[PDB]
Every structure is written in C-alpha cells, then in structure tokens.
C-alpha cells in the first residue's frame, strides 16, 4: 500500500485484475491481484480465499509456480502480492504470435509445466485450470510459470464434483458426468495444452467432440507427439498416462534446459 509501487493493470477476468506492481523495499517487480469477496467462490484457512491457501502450500521453495509473496485483506477484497518476471508474456499470447510451435520449443515448455503440475500435486495443491492463459513465459530465462489458482483444490483421492475452470479444457467425464479425479483430469488438460502448443489452437471447441475424443491435426506434428497427446487425451481416465509416464515418453527425451530454450527460440 505504502509498500507497494502500482503500474500498469495487466489484465482482469474471472480472477479479478491483475496490476503489474514493485515491492517499494527492494525494488522487486510484483504482480498485484485483487479480488472482490463477493466474487470468491471458495474458501479456507482467519477464512482466506482457497487461492491463498493453494498458493501458501506451493510457494515454498522454488518452483515453476508464480509464488506469493504476500496477501492483505481489504474491507470487500483481497489483496495478493505475486512474483512479477520481467519481462513476461503468456503462452497464449505468445501462441497467438508465433502460430504452432516447434516441437523443440513445445517439448520444453510442456516439460516445465509438467514439473510445476507435480510439484504442485507433491504440495498437496490440484490447479484444475491448466492451459495457454495460465502460463507465463520468463522470456529471459526461458522459465514457465504456472499462474491462477482460482479454479484450484487440494489434491485428494477421491472423486471431484465440482468444476470452475476453462471447459475445452476439461475432460469428457466431467462433460458427461460432472465427476473426475484430479490427476486423470489434469493429464487430459496438459494433452489439450500440448495440442495447443504444437498445432497453435486447441483442438475440440464444442461438448461433442471433446466427447467424441477424436484428435485431428492440423499442423504437421511428428507421430511420437500425435501419440502422447492422445493418450493424455484417452477417453477412459484410467487409459491417461501418469506424470512420471508422460516424462517418460519418447517425445519427451532430451529435453533443452530453460535458458537453452530462449537462446535458440525465444532470443
Ligand atoms: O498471477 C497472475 C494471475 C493471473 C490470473 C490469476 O493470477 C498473473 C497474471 N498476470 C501476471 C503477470 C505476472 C505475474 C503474475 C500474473
């Protein structure tokens, strides 16, 4: 408040608006989001926003995660102060600019989200919001970072009846069913993601073919990434691979480390 330098907002939605931000004391760059009360659907703990929460369990130590720093609480909202890298640009974005990525490019990106998804599972955290938007791009360093844990969980073993985050991105048994288990159903979202990644959209828009699960490419994509994203896309939860599978695919050998990712491919 004192504390904190306020910039430029950087964005608003269903998370509630996003200020870029410096931390007055040092200087260190922030991202600044509020929320109104009303608008928080969940709760946990004094009672925070679940965010909180998700996000106090998942930013100790260093992660692929954007960490938070700090939280106040306002009379009718929330405060969050959140890790800012500089400069930063969403896949979404950057998708929308550079069309489908090189596999090279996308083997990197998605191997970074898949260590953020297991430290975040490993923290007891479920983000249930995986895609393009929630994932910003350090464009120095080359680091991803997961961002938006406003649709999240704790992670647990049973059944989820619940859903707030993005649609085309949610599996069929929760299109069906409105029933999924966390990590069968964060695998099916990290196989629309790399979809996304490697063709430059993602790849069912309506309830039919999300159900109908049948993936045409539009891009060409090698066959050993055609394989993995179907079987993070495999209809039968039970049928999806686990992260450790996933890492151990093919496709995923040889990963380029962070830095070496924006030298070659992001400058
Ligand atoms: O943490 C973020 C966020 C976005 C939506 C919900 O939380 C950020 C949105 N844009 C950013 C830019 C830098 C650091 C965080 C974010």
């Known amino acids: 408040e004192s504390q904190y330098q306020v910039g430029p907002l950087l964005g ?3 998370f509630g608006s996003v200020y870029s931000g410096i931390r007055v004391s040092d200087n260190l760059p922030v991202a600044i989001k509020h929320v109104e009360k009303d608008r928080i659907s ?13 996000l106090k369990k998942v930013s ?8 938070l720093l700090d939280w106040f609480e306002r009379p009718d909202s929330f405060v969050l102060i959140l ?3 500089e400069p930063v640009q969403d896949l979404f974005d950057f998708i929308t600019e550079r069309g489908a990525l090189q596999e090279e490019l996308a083997r990197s990106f998605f191997w970074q989200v898949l260590e953020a998804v297991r430290h975040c599972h490993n923290c007891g955290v479920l983000h249930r919001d995986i895609k393009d938007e929630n994932i910003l791009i350090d464009l120095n360093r080359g ?4 961002i ?23 599996p069929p048994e929760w299109i069906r069913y409105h029933r999924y288990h966390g990590r069968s159903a964060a695998v099916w979202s990290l196989g629309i993601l790399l979809y996304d990644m490697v063709c430059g959209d993602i790849p069912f828009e309506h309830d039919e073919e ?8 539009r891009q060409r994509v090698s066959s050993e990434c055609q394989h993995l994203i179907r079987w993070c896309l495999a209809l039968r939860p039970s049928d999806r691979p686990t992260f450790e599978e996933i890492q151990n695919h093919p496709w995923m050998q040889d990963v380029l ?3 070496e990712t924006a030298e070659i491919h992001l400058h």
Do not use: C, N
């Not at 680091?143 to 997961?146: F, N, R, V, Y």
């Not at 073993?157 to 949610?170: C, E, H, W």
């Not at 999300?210 to 490419?217: K, L, T």
């Open 143 to 146: 680091e991803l970072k997961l």
């Open 42 to 54: 969940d709760w946990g703990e004094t009672r925070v926003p679940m965010e909180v929460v998700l």
């Open 60 to 67: 100790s130590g260093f992660s692929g995660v954007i960490r």
């Open 148 to 170: 938006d844990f406003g649709s999240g969980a704790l992670l647990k073993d049973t059944v989820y009846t619940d859903f707030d985050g993005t649609r085309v991105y949610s």
């Open 210 to 217: 999300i159900i109908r699960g049948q993936v045409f490419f």
């Open 83 to 85: 890790e800012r890298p």
């Open 257 to 259: 480390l962070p830095q």
């Open 12 to 14: 608003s939605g269903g």
